[PDB]
Amino acid sequence: TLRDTIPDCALRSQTLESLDARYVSRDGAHDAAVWFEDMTPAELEVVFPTTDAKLNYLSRTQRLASLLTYATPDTACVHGELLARKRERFAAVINRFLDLHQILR
């Protein structure tokens, strides 16, 4: 009793809105289940087999994407300037963090 949506649909040649109107938006829809399918692909678990490893990659690619979009002619975005300032300050901070410990010796 109280079946899920995956035993309900059984057909996947359609658009999302049709299925919405046919299974979840009908007045007679019993809607008596909540079960989120596992969407991670095995072709990705076999290489990143750890939530920490799946999060480090998910953050590295996020940083890459945020670098690529900010690097017709508007160019007047505060986020590009913020990323530039952050990169410059990070470079200048690591600069005075290796030399400072070179001096202390």
Partner 1 sequence: TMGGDALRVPFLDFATATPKRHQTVVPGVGTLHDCCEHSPLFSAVARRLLFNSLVPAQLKGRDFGGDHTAKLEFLAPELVRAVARLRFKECAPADVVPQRNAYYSVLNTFQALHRS
Binding at 88: pick from partner 1, Zn ion, none (beta carbon under 5-8 Å per type): none
Do 27 and 43 touch, CB atoms closer than 8 A?
no
Contact partner at residue 32 from Zn ion, partner 1, none, CB < 5 to 8 Å by partner kind: partner 1
Q: By CB under 5 A, name the one of 26, 60, 63, 79 that touches Zn ion.
A: 79
Q: 26-47 as b/e, with b when 16 or more CB fall inside 10 Å?
A: eeeeeeeeeeeeeeeeeeeeee
Residue in the structure block whose two tokens are 């007679």: 28
In this complex, which beta carbon is closest to Zn ion, that of residue 34 or of residue 76?
Answer: 76
Question: Would you give the binding string for Zn ion spanning residues 37-76, x where CB under 5 A is met?
Answer: ----------------------------------------
Q: Mention every residue, 6+ apart, whose C-beta is less than 8 A from residue 83.
A: 66, 67, 70
Q: How many residues would you count in the chain? A: 105
Compute the distance between CA of residue 53 and CA of residue 89 in angstroms, rounded to an integer: 28
Per CB under 8 A, 91 contacts partner 1: no
Instruction: Please count the residues of this chain forming the interface with partner 1, following the rule CB under 8 A.
Output: 13
In the complex, which residues of this chain contact Zn ion (CB under 5 A)?
77, 79
In the complex, which residues of this chain contact partner 1 (CB under 8 A)?
2, 4, 32-38, 51-52, 54-55
